Ligand binder design. Structure first.
Ligand SMILES: C[C@H](CS(N)(=O)=O)c1ccccc1
Ligand SMILES: C[C@H](CS(N)(=O)=O)c1ccccc1
Ligand SMILES: [Zn+2]
Length: 140
């Protein structure tokens, strides 16, 4: 689990979104595993605006942060899970590291801020849903 809180937005894994997230839906993309909902409280998170390929992610299944190199956001074939059939997930970044389903929502951070959230895993890889292209997360 986990979310990004920026302005009046909450960013979550689309497959972990709650009834309240869907009741307050701003934007969702099934191809990206992202959903953004509106919040009443102001979020303080800073979104990175950059092309970093190094950062640190939180891994709840190890209670640890790990430094990783990760690929630029791309269209990656992702195996079926129970939340999706096998499909191309877009805007996905891969790194070598540990990820279990409950790790979804762990933040990946660079020097500039929040890069994305854990979305996929298995075969010793971790996939992060990029958010850096969502420039609208920083206004109204
Ligand atoms: C929020 C919606 C249904 S509702 N109550 O009409 O908002 C929802 C249904 C199933 C899984 C996740 C979310
Ligand atoms: C079992 C699934 C497979 S997938 N292809 O990543 O959806 C999963 C593993 C680890 C983290 C998140 C999800
Ligand atoms: Zn950066």
């Amino acid at each position: 689990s986990g979310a990004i809180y920026v302005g009046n937005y909450r960013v979550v894994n689309r497959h972990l979104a709650t009834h309240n997230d869907w009741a307050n839906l701003v934007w969702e993309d099934s191809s990206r595993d992202l959903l953004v909902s509106s919040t009443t409280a102001q979020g303080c998170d800073t979104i990175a605006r950059c092309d970093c390929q190094t950062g640190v992610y939180y891994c709840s299944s190890r209670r640890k942060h790990y430094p990783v190199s990760f690929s630029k956001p791309s269209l990656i074939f992702v195996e079926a899970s129970e939340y999706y059939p096998a499909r191309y997930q877009s805007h996905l970044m891969l790194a070598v590291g540990h990820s279990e389903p409950g790790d979804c929502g762990g933040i990946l951070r660079c020097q500039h801020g929040v890069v994305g959230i854990v979305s996929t895993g298995g075969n010793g890889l971790v996939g992060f849903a990029d958010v850096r292209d969502l420039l609208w997360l920083d206004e109204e």
